[PDB]
Design a binder for these strands. Structure first.
Ligand SMILES: [Mg+2]
Ligand SMILES: [Mg+2]
Ligand SMILES: [Mg+2]
Ligand SMILES: [Mg+2]
Ligand SMILES: [Mg+2]
Ligand SMILES: [Mg+2]
Ligand SMILES: [Mg+2]
Ligand SMILES: [Mg+2]
Ligand SMILES: [Mg+2]
Ligand SMILES: [Mg+2]
Ligand SMILES: [Mg+2]
Ligand SMILES: [Mg+2]
Ligand SMILES: [Mg+2]
Ligand SMILES: [Mg+2]
Ligand SMILES: [Mg+2]
Ligand SMILES: [Mg+2]
Ligand SMILES: [Mg+2]
Ligand SMILES: [Mg+2]
Ligand SMILES: [Mg+2]
Ligand SMILES: [Mg+2]
Ligand SMILES: [Mg+2]
Ligand SMILES: [Mg+2]
Ligand SMILES: [Mg+2]
Ligand SMILES: [Mg+2]
Ligand SMILES: [Mg+2]
Ligand SMILES: [Mg+2]
Ligand SMILES: [Mg+2]
Ligand SMILES: [Mg+2]
Ligand SMILES: [Mg+2]
Ligand SMILES: [Mg+2]
Ligand SMILES: [Mg+2]
Ligand SMILES: [Mg+2]
Ligand SMILES: [Mg+2]
Ligand SMILES: [Mg+2]
Ligand SMILES: [Mg+2]
Ligand SMILES: [Mg+2]
Ligand SMILES: [Mg+2]
Ligand SMILES: [Mg+2]
Ligand SMILES: [Mg+2]
Ligand SMILES: [Mg+2]
Ligand SMILES: [Mg+2]
Ligand SMILES: [Mg+2]
Ligand SMILES: [Mg+2]
Ligand SMILES: [Mg+2]
Ligand SMILES: [Mg+2]
Ligand SMILES: [Mg+2]
Ligand SMILES: [Mg+2]
Ligand SMILES: [Mg+2]
Ligand SMILES: [Mg+2]
Ligand SMILES: [Mg+2]
Ligand SMILES: [Mg+2]
Ligand SMILES: [Mg+2]
Ligand SMILES: [Mg+2]
Ligand SMILES: [Mg+2]
Ligand SMILES: [Mg+2]
Ligand SMILES: [Mg+2]
Ligand SMILES: [Mg+2]
Ligand SMILES: [Mg+2]
Ligand SMILES: [Mg+2]
Ligand SMILES: [Mg+2]
Ligand SMILES: [Mg+2]
Ligand SMILES: [Mg+2]
Ligand SMILES: [Mg+2]
Ligand SMILES: [Mg+2]
Ligand SMILES: [Mg+2]
Ligand SMILES: [Mg+2]
Ligand SMILES: [Mg+2]
Ligand SMILES: [Mg+2]
Ligand SMILES: [Mg+2]
Ligand SMILES: [Mg+2]
Ligand SMILES: [Mg+2]
Ligand SMILES: [Mg+2]
Ligand SMILES: [Mg+2]
Ligand SMILES: [Mg+2]
Ligand SMILES: [Mg+2]
Ligand SMILES: [Mg+2]
Ligand SMILES: [Mg+2]
Ligand SMILES: [Mg+2]
Ligand SMILES: [Mg+2]
Ligand SMILES: [Mg+2]
Ligand SMILES: [Mg+2]
Ligand SMILES: [Mg+2]
Ligand SMILES: [Mg+2]
Lengths: 55, 119, 113, 207, 123
RNA sequence: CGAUGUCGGCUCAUCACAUCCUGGGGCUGAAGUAGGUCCCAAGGGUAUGGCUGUUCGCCAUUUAAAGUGGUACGCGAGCUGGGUUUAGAACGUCGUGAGACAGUUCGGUCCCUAUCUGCCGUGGGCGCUGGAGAACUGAGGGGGGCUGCUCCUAGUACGAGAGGACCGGAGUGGACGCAUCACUGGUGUUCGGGUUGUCAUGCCAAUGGCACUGCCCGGUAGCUAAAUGCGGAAGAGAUAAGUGCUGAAAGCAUCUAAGCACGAAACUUGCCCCGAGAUGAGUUCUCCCUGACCCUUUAAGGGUCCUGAAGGAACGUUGAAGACGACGACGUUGAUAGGCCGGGUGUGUAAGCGCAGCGAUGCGUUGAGCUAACCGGUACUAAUGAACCGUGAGGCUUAACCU
RNA sequence: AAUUCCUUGUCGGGUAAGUUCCGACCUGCACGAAUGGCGUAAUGAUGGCCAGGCUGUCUCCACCCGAGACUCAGUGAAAU
RNA sequence: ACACAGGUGGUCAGGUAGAGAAUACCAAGGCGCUUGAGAGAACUCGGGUGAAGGAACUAGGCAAAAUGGUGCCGUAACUUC
RNA sequence: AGGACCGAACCGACUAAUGUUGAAAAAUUAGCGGAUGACUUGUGGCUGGGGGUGAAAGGCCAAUCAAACCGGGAGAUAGCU
């Protein structure tokens, strides 16, 4: 169940090539409150599709 | 496997899951908007909406039935007094799921669920 | 779907009577011995009624010389011809599978009035 | 050539004998022909069919231009059937359901219902070891998958756990019970592949 | 659905009371037997002064199963006891002269005309 | 020997031909049937139990047959651990004795999170010489192949009889495999009901909690097998052993050296499935981009301004798709999901009231109430106007049409 | 026979079938009389066998509930 | 060795059923076990149910399943009574 | 009355499964035996290494016992690696 030789930094980098992240593409800038948020997510102030819903 | 089934397990045995669903429904009826995770609120939709549909016709049998569903006289009286006539003319769909980011301690994708006649 | 319900109701039967699980029923069915379509009479209590439209069934169980016989008739099949209710029974259940482990006097049922 | 139906549901057909037939209800709309391929243009003799109707704001511009040059209404897919010699189909034709007004057996091809990451006992019909009598952490595992040191390799095609189903499978020679020219139905007998809403290619039989 | 080491009762007056199937006949890895199937049985118990002795081995046709048999419509016929009718080891005719209990219509062939004629009922 | 775990069982197997069946034959001290023996052939198939630790065996009973071998007497980083081969103990025997016995009973820890190769599945990258979306052809690979019985031919051929054919045709079974839920059923701790103990909702009533779902009883969808559909083929090619036709070296003869015909479940096909990463990167169809300069080393070169198409990707509602990716449906021009309405099914006459009895309980309202995942509908909520990757006519040499 | 190699001795019961079990035969390789012989009711987390009840132990697995496994976020080993 | 499902002697011993300090629910009291969110694949662990058959499994009924209480009737071979 | 009976405290450790680099250098779970006695346990004392103690297994004597542990002879010796 345990390894036989020591694997190279070549093999370790090749395996880690896939675990790197992808960024969030582009934040939706809300039209009437000018601030950035994710797609379909309410902002920090509380706006979503214009209207303030929340306190 | 999960072919044509419905109802999220939510990492809980069934007694605990039913008890926390009626507890979250009581908390929603009291505080009028709650903030929870996303699949918990997505399962709360199909639980807190039958209560308002049941209390959209007020009677003694339906009032004892909502007492069976929610186990609390405050939730029952608040339902059949104020959440009856407010959603009288509303053909279902009394909740409004709003996604709001993530939780800082376990990265759970949060959600703000309210009633539509809130403000 | 509605297509299945169309093909279902175009050949579902039309004179199914009101037998309730417990109401003893005499069924006349078509047995072919040699080349003669004749009737056989299977009478006994009805212990299981299942409704799926055309796929409906009911399980008549009798005692024919000690060895009891169940038989699940498909209702809208044309292999049954006649259904008749001898007496009107009344249990407080819906599928009397408890009648199997009882025989004789301990498996009668109070009449419905 | 065949038709492209959509498997609605299974039900019974009763006859006057009293028999019961498990009948699958393959609805078959008017299959449009979009492009007829011959030897000098393309390389074989085979036609292309389509059914249904997709949304205009969902059909993309290659597909929509293909259908609009083909001269039919915008369908929902494409399928391709070989032409046995003795069929000259026009590019505007619309293959009805009455093609099966003479055959007795059809061969039905469709996507089987995918059952997940099914193990060996569910997939390749292995057996189990004992559930008592000492057996420890090995109630349903595969077991010995090879020999000692010669081969020294698991032979290719060894039966193992994987994805059961969700693959095109074909049942051969199911008897056609009815052809409904009014409801656009083909009523076959048996158990065709696919669930409700699957797309099934129905061909006239080979064997 | 009768296997090896079933314990059938006996539906004729041949002499046995409680027989045990030992080998279904008909094919390799033959598992079950419906009705109208020839199995081989041993005899656990007898009536004292009968045609058969406890401890012999002789064939028997199954006539009644608790699994029931499906008609070409779907009317299955459950019973309450797996039964059988004893036979001879070579000539293969029923040894008894009288059959207790009912019998199905699956048994009716060219082969079992004696059993279907000697049954009281046929169901 | 700074270690490769040693018998047998289970679970998986795979190969060989010196074949056990099925296929084809030649001879027979082969009438038929059943055979005997020999030649070709490995595509499939090849038993359940009793006793022992067993392999082996004997036995009971089937089967078409219950193959012979390898593969570390296959397989313990897969599984018992009965036997063998630890420490206890005893019997026979040996030894004065410690002890010993391929003699014997009784008892006795079987560890490991898989780096690499291998294998089963499934994805990302880039390639395929503009890009994108679809269908394909199929180089190549895999799967599958088994067979009993009954009847017709026909009690005919044969035989004195009993018995009993070859060849061919039909049906019904076994085993194996694929598919499905319409039937029979199982499950169905999310639906309905009964019921015990106890606690709580002030109390009666009605309900909820907890006791493996408290214990039962039914059961929808789904998944399923014991349930029901289907399969194995037919045919074609080239053949093996064998059979031949014509025919000479060898005036005859001769199945062969010239030529040709027949011949098997074996091989190539036919049936199913994968399949252009098939770098030999294929074929056809469709759609989209038709702008400016600036520079030096002039090149299939670099940089700037405008442009951002086809489409993809991301996000969201999700799915009879699913480990995560992936594949599919849908995003207001909308039924994708939840809700709601009508239905269906399930359970089996709710609550409250009235009557009847002392009372438990019954009766009327009542096939009532409740009804998850199913069916057909309805925008009531949730699927945002965007922003993002992708570009701006696609090299050279030859040849054919054009003028 | 916890002693018995030949030996699965032979005969009988039990089972369709019983190298084990029980009852006898004595041909005791190599039992045997306080390192006791042979009996024996009770008792045994003991040894061998049979039968009734029971059941997914099995023919043959199927579904369902939970804890892991799998995905995201935090911390983060090991023998080799 | 650890903020470790282990070990450690005395005293106090409520309610409802129960014979009981067992057991089930509770009061006073004290806690929710110092990683969570999903998804609901294989496979493993703890469990529930199962057609028809019932030891065919196997070294061996190992494991599971069943039997379970209070009062009465009744009870054999053998026996050291 | 009893080294009587069934059974919780308490003492154990018979079977199975889980763990076995675990939660634990022998445990948890479900069953199991004794449970007024040759019982069990608190606290203090005693027996010292060829010695103790032993309802006897070469067992136990500080996670070690066919002769403990710590220092010393001591850099024992080693035809062996
Ligand atoms: Mg090395
Ligand atoms: Mg990685
Ligand atoms: Mg759904
Ligand atoms: Mg978790
Ligand atoms: Mg509970
Ligand atoms: Mg799926
Ligand atoms: Mg098995
Ligand atoms: Mg283990
Ligand atoms: Mg296990
Ligand atoms: Mg190995
Ligand atoms: Mg090699
Ligand atoms: Mg060695
Ligand atoms: Mg080494
Ligand atoms: Mg050969
Ligand atoms: Mg011969
Ligand atoms: Mg071979
Ligand atoms: Mg070969
Ligand atoms: Mg071998
Ligand atoms: Mg060898
Ligand atoms: Mg070996
Ligand atoms: Mg040897
Ligand atoms: Mg082994
Ligand atoms: Mg190995
Ligand atoms: Mg051993
Ligand atoms: Mg010893
Ligand atoms: Mg030795
Ligand atoms: Mg790997
Ligand atoms: Mg790729
Ligand atoms: Mg091939
Ligand atoms: Mg079904
Ligand atoms: Mg269905
Ligand atoms: Mg059912
Ligand atoms: Mg249930
Ligand atoms: Mg079902
Ligand atoms: Mg209660
Ligand atoms: Mg009360
Ligand atoms: Mg409570
Ligand atoms: Mg052929
Ligand atoms: Mg000649
Ligand atoms: Mg000549
Ligand atoms: Mg030829
Ligand atoms: Mg063949
Ligand atoms: Mg071939
Ligand atoms: Mg619309
Ligand atoms: Mg909807
Ligand atoms: Mg109904
Ligand atoms: Mg109620
Ligand atoms: Mg009422
Ligand atoms: Mg009424
Ligand atoms: Mg109803
Ligand atoms: Mg409804
Ligand atoms: Mg719908
Ligand atoms: Mg011996
Ligand atoms: Mg004997
Ligand atoms: Mg003896
Ligand atoms: Mg002796
Ligand atoms: Mg002696
Ligand atoms: Mg002496
Ligand atoms: Mg035995
Ligand atoms: Mg992580
Ligand atoms: Mg802690
Ligand atoms: Mg602790
Ligand atoms: Mg108390
Ligand atoms: Mg307690
Ligand atoms: Mg699970
Ligand atoms: Mg169980
Ligand atoms: Mg069962
Ligand atoms: Mg049941
Ligand atoms: Mg049963
Ligand atoms: Mg036995
Ligand atoms: Mg056995
Ligand atoms: Mg066996
Ligand atoms: Mg046990
Ligand atoms: Mg138990
Ligand atoms: Mg005592
Ligand atoms: Mg314990
Ligand atoms: Mg006791
Ligand atoms: Mg010393
Ligand atoms: Mg010793
Ligand atoms: Mg020690
Ligand atoms: Mg010494
Ligand atoms: Mg030294
Ligand atoms: Mg010295």
């Amino acid at each position: 169940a345990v390894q036989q030789n020591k694997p190279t930094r070549s093999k370790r980098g090749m395996r880690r090539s896939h675990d790197a992240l992808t960024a969030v593409t582009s934040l939706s800038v809300d039209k009437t409150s000018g601030e950035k948020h994710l797609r379909h997510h309410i902002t920090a102030d509380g706006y979503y599709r214009g209207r303030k819903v929340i306190a | 496997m999960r072919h044509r089934k419905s109802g999220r397990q939510l990492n809980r045995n069934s007694s605990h899951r039913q008890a926390m669903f009626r507890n979250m429904a009581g908390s929603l009826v009291r505080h009028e908007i709650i903030k929870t995770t996303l699949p918990k609120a997505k399962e709360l939709r199909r639980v807190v909406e039958p209560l308002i549909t049941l209390a959209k016709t007020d009677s003694v049998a339906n009032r004892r039935l909502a007492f069976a569903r929610t186990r609390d006289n405050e939730i029952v009286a608040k339902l059949f007094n104020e959440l009856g006539p407010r959603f009288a003319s509303r053909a279902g769909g009394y909740t409004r799921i709003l996604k709001c980011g993530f939780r800082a301690g376990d990265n759970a994708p949060m959600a703000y669920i309210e009633l539509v006649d809130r403000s | 779907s509605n297509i299945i319900k169309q093909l279902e109701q175009e050949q579902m039967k039309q004179d199914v009577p009101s037998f309730r699980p417990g109401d003893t029923v005499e069924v006349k069915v078509w047995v072919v011995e040699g080349s003669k379509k004749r009737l056989q009479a299977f009478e006994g209590v009805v212990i299981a009624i299942r409704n799926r439209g055309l796929h409906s069934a009911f399980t008549v169980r009798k005692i024919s010389n000690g060895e009891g016989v169940e038989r699940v008739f498909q209702t809208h099949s044309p292999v049954v011809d006649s259904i008749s209710v001898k007496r009107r029974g009344a249990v407080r259940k819906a599928k009397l599978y408890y009648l199997r482990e009882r025989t004789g006097k301990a498996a009668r049922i109070k009449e419905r009035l | 050539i065949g038709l492209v139906g959509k498997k609605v549901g299974m039900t019974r057909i009763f006859t006057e004998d009293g028999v019961s037939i498990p009948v699958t209800v393959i609805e078959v709309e008017a299959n449009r022909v979009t492009q007829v391929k011959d030897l000098a243009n393309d390389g074989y003799r085979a036609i292309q069919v389509t059914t249904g109707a997709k949304k205009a704001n969902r059909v993309t511009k290659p597909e929509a231009g293909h259908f609009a040059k083909a001269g039919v209404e915008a369908g929902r897919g494409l399928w391709e059937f070989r032409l046995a010699e003795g069929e000259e189909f026009t590019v505007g034709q619309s293959i009805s359901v009455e093609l099966f007004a003479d055959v007795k057996k059809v061969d039905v091809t469709g996507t089987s219902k995918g059952k997940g990451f099914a193990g060996t006992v569910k997939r390749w019909n292995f057996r189990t070891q004992d559930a008592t009598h000492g057996n420890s952490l090995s109630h349903r595992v595969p077991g010995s998958i090879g020999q000692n040191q010669t081969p020294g390799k698991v032979f290719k095609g060894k039966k193992m756990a994987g994805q059961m189903g969700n693959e095109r499978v074909t049942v051969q020679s199911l008897d056609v019970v009815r052809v409904d020219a009014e409801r656009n139905l083909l009523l076959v007998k048996g158990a065709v592949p696919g669930a409700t809403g699957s797309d099934l290619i129905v061909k006239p039989a080979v064997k | 659905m009768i296997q090896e080491q079933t314990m059938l009762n006996v539906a004729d007056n041949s002499g046995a009371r409680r027989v045990m199937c030992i080998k279904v006949l008909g094919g390799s890895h033959r598992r079950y037997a419906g009705v109208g199937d020839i199995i081989k049985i041993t005899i656990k118990e007898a009536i004292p002064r009968g045609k058969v002795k406890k401890g012999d081995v002789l064939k028997a046709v199954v006539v009644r199963t608790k699994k029931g048999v499906r008609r070409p419509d779907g009317s299955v016929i459950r019973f309450d006891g797996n039964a059988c009718v004893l036979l001879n080891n070579n000539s293969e005719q029923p040894i008894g002269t009288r059959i207790f209990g009912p019998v199905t219509r699956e048994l009716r062939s060219e082969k079992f005309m004696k059993i279907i004629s000697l049954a009281p009922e046929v169901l």
